Amino acid sequence: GPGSRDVEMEEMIEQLQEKVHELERQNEVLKNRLISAKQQLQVQ
Amino acid sequence: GPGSRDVEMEEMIEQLQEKVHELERQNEVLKNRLISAKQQLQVQ
Numbered sequence: 001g002p003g004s005r006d007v008e009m010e011e012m013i014e015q016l017q018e019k020v021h022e023l024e025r026q027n028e029v030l031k032n033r034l035i036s037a038k039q040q041l042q043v044q
Numbered sequence: 045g046p047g048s049r050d051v052e053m054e055e056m057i058e059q060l061q062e063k064v065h066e067l068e069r070q071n072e073v074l075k076n077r078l079i080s081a082k083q084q085l086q087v088q
Contacts, residue, residue, distance in 0.1 A: 016060050023067035030074035037081065 013057075016057070016064070020060060020063050020067065023064060023071065027067055027071050027074070030071055030078070033078055034074065037078070
């Protein structure tokens, strides 16, 4: 008989949560690139 | 199909999908700001 757990449901949810996490990481990288460029422009 | 939905689960899934969309929009803007500045650095 089928198991109590729906593994496919678990994976679908985990995939969506990981998509949010990876976009947040990419957002942070972009923000840091902008910070870095502005810091470089401000010298002198 | 038949219209049976768990309201709280559906709302959480939609909120996560909207977060993905918002992060994608935000990251497009940051990337395009960086591209714009590089293009300006090419003004000869």
